[PDB]
Symmetry: D2
């Protein structure tokens, strides 16, 4: 049933890139955001920061994926890099592979996200278990992560 997680990334902006084999054996949280989205800035990113800070990469890896689908000329990777420091993000952030002639970048298209913020949760076996659009409750998110972490 469930598809494997395969990110299509133009570049990793603050970290060494991650292979799939790197992420296998860990639960993965991909936070998909645009830098200029209030839902992403006020809620989703800070929620990801919290996770990264609390749990170690042995167990869970947080990946930021900047998937810009509108206003491309102002949301450049240069802009992103500033946004990242300015907001103090320390987890790995990747720019979604853009597509020629297309507003929607590749990962976002492939997994058919409704928009940003979205989160993608993958299991230790590298396979996608949840995709959620919008604001996610801290409690609900904890239950979801915990569930993934402990199942055999």
């Amino acid at each position: 049933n469930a598809p494997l997680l395969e990110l299509d990334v133009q570049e990793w902006v603050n970290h060494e890139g991650l292979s799939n084999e790197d992420l296998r054996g860990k639960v993965v949280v991909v936070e998909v955001f645009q830098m200029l989205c209030p839902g992403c800035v006020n809620h989703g990113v800070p929620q990801a920061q919290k996770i990264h800070r609390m749990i170690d990469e042995s167990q869970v890896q947080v990946i930021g994926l900047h998937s810009v689908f509108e206003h491309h000329d102002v949301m450049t990777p240069e802009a992103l890099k500033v946004f990242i420091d300015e907001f103090g993000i320390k987890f790995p952030v990747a720019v979604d592979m853009p597509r020629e002639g297309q507003r929607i970048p590749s990962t976002m298209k492939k997994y058919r996200l409704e928009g940003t913020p979205s989160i993608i949760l993958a299991d230790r076996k590298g396979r996608i278990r949840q995709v959620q659009f919008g604001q996610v409750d801290d409690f609900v998110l904890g239950l979801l992560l915990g569930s993934l972490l402990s199942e055999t």
Copy 2:
């Protein structure tokens, strides 16, 4: 985990519910919320968190239990006052009164599990083994991670 104690509560009375039994509990993750009715951290944070859990997760999976352990101002935090507290705050989950001990401020369950104070949380697994005890404010995210983890264990 070989020595994690089994959850056993020593209780004077169940205030708003028929009492649960240990059998009733097994196969469910148990959250025990240990509170005093006039403790600000409990009223502001801990009880509303337990209420949220009770609303969100079905009783077939998680059972929330309130435990009123009065360790100060006993004459004020009576079982009658607690019934009123429960009505005023709309607490729907089952609430027990910690068995008082003659001559002592600290009640029986609080003593037994060595609690620092209120609020405290006790989490037990489907087998009844106490897996976490925590004093004070607990983040919603952390709480979810702990429960989700307990819920999915083989």
Copy 3:
């Protein structure tokens, strides 16, 4: 404003402070927080909002007064229980107990101003006259606007 009634608390006792007269209050904006110790709206929102005002604004400008108007469950919400509530929650503003009326659940100040329940706020101006009465949750910004406005009136 000619029509506005003066603030007149009917008080059985002042629990934590020497009593205040209207004369002591004159020249100050008065905030009266009408509460029950066991009401969620009060415990969660109104009382803490009153503490914030008390901490933030000097008594040379604004006086905060607590009025405990118990209209239900009186046996549980006695003045002794109130004293404990005050200590536990760290309330440092003066608290008065609304004078009870014999044979009736609703106390005197509450009846007189026809409060809907708790929490309520009563604001009076620098000449001691009641300018607002509000039931329920009041947003912090709106309350600031209301106070700020009274403070600067001629």
Copy 4:
């Protein structure tokens, strides 16, 4: 000091004359589009005032004052940010000073940084300048006081 702003352009609204200003309390929210404090707290709070209080009483003004990272924080970007965050109060772009990092309005009022709030009375006179996060209640008291003053 009578409030006077040095504006290169108004992005989302026609220009504000003194004639528009007169008789009103004015709130100037001085911000950067990528400054967290502005984004998290200050801009939303400004939006709240604007939503809460009619324009006939209080006029909320956003002033974009880019002192760093300039090419990022362009008037083209700002329009996008306003659109994304749904800002409906008039927002003006600081006039820049040639060869200078900090702009004209920020300069003249000796503002510490972003975010900053500038409060002016009904007669247009500047009554308060404050930097950093401000409590909703405090902001209420200050505006409330200005509104009622005679």
